[PDB]
């Protein structure tokens, strides 16, 4: 054996550790003693048994042994690094070839004048150094909760710097006693010095595995790439698909140019015959008994008026309106609320210094004297302060105030060192535990982590609620904050849960809605004037009281069945009926009016029966089409959409009944007591010669609208939902601006044994032997791609760490018994529950049987003050147990800011995706907002089926009545053009797709068929007098049933809507005006210009 060093030669400094004694290479080391060999192998390993002629003695191994142990806690987390760390120094002093890779440089004289090496040069393989640095790269310290490389390598970033800290001459701070040159440049041809090269280990090594938290290699690297979208190029994939179709499709058509079956099976034929006879009897009975039918209608609007007012009439809460109770997300919310309690009521308050940082001597002193008012002496009318309602982690501990005031224990820190004191707490919240023993992250409290330069702070107050007493407290808080007089240069934007249920029901848009409908009545009376010029006000006024009587009858009839009328019903239902119910007034009146001429059945009562007989079949067929469209939506899942599907289907059926029996009686009565003597629709419509041009223009419009379809965005911005100029406008605009923390995410695990070792390894995140794709590792690796980018609050890891023997303060039991040893008995009789040699980082002595609970109860009740690892404060309400098994548990994770509607839907997908990413765990992710955004997942395919199925109904409900497949297909061809055209202006007009929009898009089909169905039927059931040809019939219908549309639904809904543009609410202006102003212009264009041109070319 050859050694360049051996033995010990005094010390280089008084009152200091001794220094090795350099020796030349000529000498040979003596045989090691028995004691030295046993100690050397124990500290280093079993591989040293073969070698028994090392270059170290008893005095050297003991010194080396002591120095290795002191560094053991730092690197004990990752055994791979620990082995490498000890291997380097073990071969430094005991390698038989010590001088081969260690070259002495200078020698000095010690206190005894012996030989002591001042410095030496050590050479090693570059790859070996990289592996060593890689092994200890990401080791995480326990107490510091941060990278352990800082303490061992001084924050080194490369192996060259890290190794230098090891070899640097630092006699102070327990460092090395001499300088060591870890050079990386040597040649093997010297024949005297060879770079050190021995076994090395890495994190990925199967033998010396390391926890994923301690090394990236161990973490699950599979992580299959997430992809659930179809986009190609700068446009959506469907847009490219449609555009590509036009190019290729046009090629086939261009080359070609350059180069009713219903007679059979007359069962349907007889339908058009008996139906007219049936309505003739209804018309006959409604004209011969006008009083018997009018009294009942007046009686019905009295009995139903009784019900809608007194017997029962109720609205619904925001949760009921939006989310269906059967949705899987809501079923999960009930489980979370039932077990882990409802989520806290959050009352955010923002203090903003627009042009600088809020933190100052004036504001810090001022806010402390206003945050001590809200949380101390703000008794509401019921005389309940915040303390009564505030949320306490446990009864002993005070409640939580997520504000920077909680730093300094809520007391003034004096105007001498506030800047310095606040900075320290933010960096390490553990050492500044608030009065509730819960760490406060700086991201939540402050907008900017700089703290001193932060431009605002968050004063979120969390209430556990006390059964409607909390609801009353926010009233005082809401009033109090508004009345606050903040100093110059500051502003307050706040929020309170009462705001959503209070601010929402505060709009005064009824003024504009009432006026708009008032104008509709005024025009309707003047639009019923006779051909000569007489004005039938009594008929129009009475006719408008029948359409408004159907709403009351339906709105009161359903309240008899327990249905609740949503606030949406107050707008959509009146609009639909005033359109369906106004067309029938003009069609029946004009048909009678045209029956005044031609003197068919001169008798006044006969002129009406003929009028009903001619026009009722189209009215009934349109009614079935509109009933079928809404009835389909009744199969939807959302309750607000489902609610409308039931109201409209009834508000329209009742309208049909009152527009064929009650109104006919009014018409019969009015005309009889009036006895009026019989004294551009053709000039312009003669332009029908431009048939091909109209089809081309309207066909190009449809095709161009088909490529903008996939550009529609989902979601409903809440900022517009509430009335404008509110106190929320400066909050919602500020929650997306100065808030850097997203909603909490609760990874609820259910029915997992969590006692047998096998199950514990699926949640471990800090131990080695646990499964690679555990709950923590998977969620740790998903912090970089998913929207869930905040550390997991793993209680299982904390519980096991609490048992660590090194944490003597945390766990302590009385000797000879399992009784706990609280701080009230500081006598040193108590010892740690787990022995030093039992607990290991590789889950060796961890509880497996009933002992898991024997220590979980001790942990969960730990004070948490003596040491940061405790259970009472952080994880007392996180897990549900019954002394035998953990029924369920929760791992709070939290989202990222989520400051847009697209992000909100994106966040929900991550919860559903991650929830399903674990097939071995009965797990689900709960966040407060998940229930609201459940619909948007299937809102894409859903609206295809609801609208796609409605079109088929139009083609099938109107096929029997028309008995002409060609005319029925065209009717369904123009009804689909309207929605597709309206479906592309939604993207262009900035109207999103949601429940509020989905219902509106359904009544576009219900109202789109209203315009076109009448014209198509008159084109197919023309009287024998007119010629039987495409052009003549089309011209006849527009003269006959075209004026009833231009002066009826078209203008009636266009005169009132135009004035409706002056609505103040942003939600009403977006989803209810920009969509009912587009279906009255798109449908009017498509029914009065496209349809006459299309039918002529049927
Ligand atoms: C004439 C107009 C004013 C009638 C509108 C009917 C309202 C009763 C509906 C329409 C859209 C609904 C909103 C659509 C979206 C949401 C989801 C959600 O919005 C939020 O701001 C909370 C989001 C979260 O919890 O993170 C809570 C209910 C709310 C505001 C809804 C409350 C009830 C609203 C305002
Ligand atoms: C069941 C099938 C075989 C019937 C074929 C008849 C078609 C003419 C129907 C079937 C589905 C319908 C579509 C279903 C849904 C929509 C979206 C909707 O427009 C939008 O604003 C987009 C909404 C969205 O889907 O996100 C209304 C028109 C459109 C394209 C419909 C147009 C007419 C379509 C293509
Ligand atoms: C202040 C300490 C706690 C910091 C630096 C962390 C770990 C210490 C204990 C480590 C870091 C580098 C290590 C180190 C470098 C050099 C020497 C000199 C050698 O002849 C004996 C081993 C010894 C002494 C070892 C073991 C102990 C040291 C000094
Ligand atoms: C807000 O921060 C600013 C620093 O950017 C504080 O200082 C004054 O800010 C106003 C603008 O609001 C300027 O007009 C003054 O010139 C600034 N003075 C100084 C000395 O910087 C400001 O006081 C802060 N607002 C508070 C504490 O209410
Ligand atoms: C504590 O709760 C657990 C979980 O609910 C109970 O264990 C379950 O008991 C049901 C029957 O009630 C079994 O079907 C399950 O297989 C058990 N295990 C799990 C993981 O659910 C346990 O019985 C409860 N302890 C007491 C004393 O009631
Ligand atoms: C966890 O690490 C401990 C500490 O090394 C291991 O304990 C030793 O395991 C070997 C396995 O054969 C036994 O021969 C020893 O008697 C055990 N004790 C000691 C002090 O060495 C334990 O095996 C490891 N377990 C796992 C699963 O890795």
From Swiss-Prot:
Disulphide bridges: 3-55, 9-21, 44-90, 56-94, 78-210, 81-136, 203-215, 212-219, 390-399, 425-432, 764-770, 810-867, 811-833, 821-830
Q: Name one Pfam family in it.
A: ACR_tran
Q: Which InterPro entries match?
A: Acrflvin-R (IPR001036), HMGCR/SNAP/NPC1-like_SSD (IPR053958), NPC1_MLD (IPR053956), NPC1_N (IPR032190), SSD (IPR000731)
Predominant localisation class: membrane
Tell me the compartments it is located in.
Answer: Vacuole membrane
- Provide the alphabetized UniProt keywords: Disulfide bond, Glycoprotein, Lipid metabolism, Lipid transport, Membrane, Signal, Sphingolipid metabolism, Transmembrane, Transmembrane helix, Transport, Vacuole
Glycosylated residues (UniProt): 103, 125, 158, 266, 353, 465, 842, 882
The protein's matches in SUPFAM superfamilies, at most eight in alphabetical order, are given as:
Multidrug efflux transporter AcrB transmembrane domain (SSF82866)
What membrane topology term does the record carry?
Multi-pass membrane protein
Q: Name one GO biological process term.
A: sterol transport
Instruction: List GO terms (cellular component aspect).
Output: endoplasmic reticulum; fungal-type vacuole membrane; membrane
Annotated membrane-spanning segments are: 240-259, 293-313, 508-528, 537-557, 568-588, 619-639, 650-670, 694-714, 942-962, 969-989, 996-1016, 1041-1061, 1075-1095
Q: Which GO terms describe its molecular function?
A: sterol binding; transmembrane transporter activity
User: Which family does the entry's similarity section mention?
Assistant: Belongs to the patched family.
Q: Which PANTHER family match?
A: NPC INTRACELLULAR CHOLESTEROL TRANSPORTER 1
User: What protein does this entry describe?
Assistant: NPC intracellular sterol transporter 1-related protein 1
| Species whose genome carries this gene | Saccharomyces cerevisiae (strain ATCC 204508 / S288c)
Traced from the root, the source organism's taxonomic lineage reads:
Eukaryota, Fungi, Dikarya, Ascomycota, Saccharomycotina
- The gene for this chain is NCR1
């Amino acid at each position: 054996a050859t050694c360049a060093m051996y033995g010990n030669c005094g010390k280089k400094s008084v009152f200091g550790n001794e220094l090795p004694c350099p020796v030349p290479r000529s000498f040979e080391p003596p045989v090691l003693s028995d004691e030295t060999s046993k100690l050397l192998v124990e500290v280093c390993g079993e591989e040293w048994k073969e070698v028994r002629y090392a270059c170290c003695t008893k005095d050297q191994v003991v010194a080396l042994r002591d120095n290795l142990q002191k560094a053991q806690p730092l690197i004990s987390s990752c055994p791979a690094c620990l082995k490498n760390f000890n291997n380097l120094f073990c071969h430094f002093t005991c390698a038989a070839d010590q001088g081969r890779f260690v070259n002495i440089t200078k020698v000095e004289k010690s206190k005894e004048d012996k030989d002591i090496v001042a410095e030496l040069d050590v050479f090693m393989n570059s790859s070996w150094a990289s592996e060593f640095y890689d092994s200890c790269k990401n080791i995480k310290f326990s107490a510091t909760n941060g990278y352990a490389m800082d303490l061992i390598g001084g924050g080194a970033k490369n192996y060259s710097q890290f190794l230098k800290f090891l070899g640097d001459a630092k006699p102070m701070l327990g460092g090395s006693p001499f300088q060591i040159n870890y050079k990386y440049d040597l040649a093997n041809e010297e024949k005297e010095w060879q770079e050190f090269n021995d076994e090395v280990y890495a994190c990925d090594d199967a033998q010396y595995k390391c926890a994923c938290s301690d090394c990236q290699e161990s973490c699950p690297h599979l992580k299959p790439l997430k992809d659930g979208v179809c986009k190609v190029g700068p446009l959506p994939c469907f847009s490219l698909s449609v555009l590509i179709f036009y190019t290729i499709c046009a090629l086939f058509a261009f080359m070609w140019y350059y180069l009713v079956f219903e007679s059979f099976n007359n069962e349907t034929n007889f339908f058009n015959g008996k139906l007219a006879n049936l309505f003739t009897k209804v018309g006959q009975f409604s004209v011969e008994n006008p009083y018997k039918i009018l009294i009942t209608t007046v009686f019905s609007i009295f009995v139903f008026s009784f019900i809608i007012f007194q017997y029962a009439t109720l609205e619904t809460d925001p949760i009921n309106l939006w989310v269906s109770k059967n949705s899987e997300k809501f079923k999960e919310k009930e489980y979370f609320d039932d077990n882990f309690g409802p989520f806290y009521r959050t009352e955010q308050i923002f203090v903003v210094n627009e042009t600088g940082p809020v933190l100052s001597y004036e504001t810090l002193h001022w806010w402390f004297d206003v945050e001590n008012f809200i949380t101390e002496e703000l008794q509401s009318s019921e005389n309940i302060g915040y303390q009564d309602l505030c949320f306490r982690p446990t009864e002993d501990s005070t409640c939580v105030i997520e504000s920077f005031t909680q730093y300094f224990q809520g007391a003034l820190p004096n105007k001498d060192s506030w800047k310095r004191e606040l900075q320290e707490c933010g960096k390490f919240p553990v050492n500044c535990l608030p009065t509730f023993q819960q760490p406060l992250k700086t991201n939540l409290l402050f907008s900017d982590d700089d703290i001193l330069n932060a431009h605002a702070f968050v004063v979120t107050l969390l209430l556990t609620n006390h059964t409607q007493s909390a609801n009353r407290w926010e009233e005082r808080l809401e009033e109090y904050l508004l009345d606050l007089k903040v100093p110059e240069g500051l502003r307050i934007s706040f929020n309170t849960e009462i705001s959503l249920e209070k601010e929402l029901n505060n709009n005064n848009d009824i003024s504009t809605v009432a006026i708009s409908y008032l104008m509709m009545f005024l025009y309707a009376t003047w639009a019923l004037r006779r051909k000569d010029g007489k004005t039938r006000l009594l008929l129009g006024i009475s006719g408008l009281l029948i359409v408004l009587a159907s709403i009351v009858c339906a709105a009161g009839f359903l309240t008899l069945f327990g249905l609740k009328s949503t606030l949406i019903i107050a707008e959509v239902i009146p609009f639909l009926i005033l359109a369906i119910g106004i067309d029938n007034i003009f069609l029946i009146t004009h048909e009678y009016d045209r029956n005044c001429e031609q003197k068919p059945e001169y008798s006044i009562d006969q002129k009406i029966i003929s009028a009903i007989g001619r026009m009722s079949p189209s009215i009934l067929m349109s009614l079935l089409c509109q009933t079928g469209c809404f009835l389909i939506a009744a199969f939807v899942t959302m309750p607000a959409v489902h609610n409308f599907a039931i109201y409209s289907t009834v508000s329209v059926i009742f309208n049909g009944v009152l527009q064929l029996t009650a109104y006919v009686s009014i018409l019969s009565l009015y005309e009889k007591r009036s006895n009026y003597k019989q004294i551009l629709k053709t000039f312009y419509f003669k332009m029908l010669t431009q048939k091909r041009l109209i089809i081309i223009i309207f066909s190009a419009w449809f095709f161009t609208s088909l490529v903008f379809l996939p550009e529609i965005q989902f979601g409903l911005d809440q900022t517009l939902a509430v009335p404008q100029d509110s106190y929320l406008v400066d909050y919602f605009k500020d929650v997306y601006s100065f808030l850097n923390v997203g909603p909490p995410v609760y990874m609820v695990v259910k029915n997992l044994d969590l006692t047998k070792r096998q199950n514990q390894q699926k949640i471990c995140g800090k131990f080695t032997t646990c499964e690679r794709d555990s709950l923590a590792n998977v969620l740790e690796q998903e912090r970089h791609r998913s929207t869930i980018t905040e550390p997991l609050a793993n209680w299982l890891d904390d519980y096991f760490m609490f048992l660590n023997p090194q944490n003597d303060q945390c766990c302590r039991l009385k000797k000879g018994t399992d009784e706990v040893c609280p701080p009230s008995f500081p006598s040193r009789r108590c010892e740690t529950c787990f022995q030093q040699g039992s607990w290991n980082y590789n889950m060796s002595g961890f509880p497996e049987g009933k002992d898991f609970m024997e220590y979980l109860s001790i942990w969960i009740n730990a004070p948490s003050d003596p040491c940061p690892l405790g259970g009472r404060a952080p994880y007392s309400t996180a897990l549900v147990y019954n002394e035998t098994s953990v029924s369920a548990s929760v791992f709070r994770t939290a989202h990222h800011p989520l400051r847009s509607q697209k992000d909100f839907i994106q966040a929900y997908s991550d919860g559903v995706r991650i929830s399903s990413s674990f097939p071995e765990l009965d797990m689900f992710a709960y966040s407060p907002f998940y229930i609201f955004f459940v619909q948007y997942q299937t809102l894409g395919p859903l609206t295809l089926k609801l609208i796609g199925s409605a079109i088929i109904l139009i083609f099938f409900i109107s096929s029997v009545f028309l008995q002409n497949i060609r005319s029925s297909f065209l009717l369904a061809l123009v009804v689909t053009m309207i929605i597709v055209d309206i479906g592309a202006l939604m993207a262009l007009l900035g109207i999103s797709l949601n429940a509020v929009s989905l219902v509106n898009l359904i009544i576009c089909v219900g109202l789109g068929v209203e315009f076109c169905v009448h014209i198509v039927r008159s084109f197919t059931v023309v009287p024998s007098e007119t010629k039987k040809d495409a052009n003549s019939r089309v011209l006849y219908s527009l003269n006959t049933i075209g004026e009833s549309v231009i002066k009826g639904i078209t203008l009636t809904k266009f005169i009132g809507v135009c004035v409706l543009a002056f609505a103040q609410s942003k939600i009403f202006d977006v989803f209810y005006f920009r969509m009912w102003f587009t279906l009255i212009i798109v449908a009017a264009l498509h029914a009065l210009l496209f349809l006459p041109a299309l039918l002529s070319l049927f």
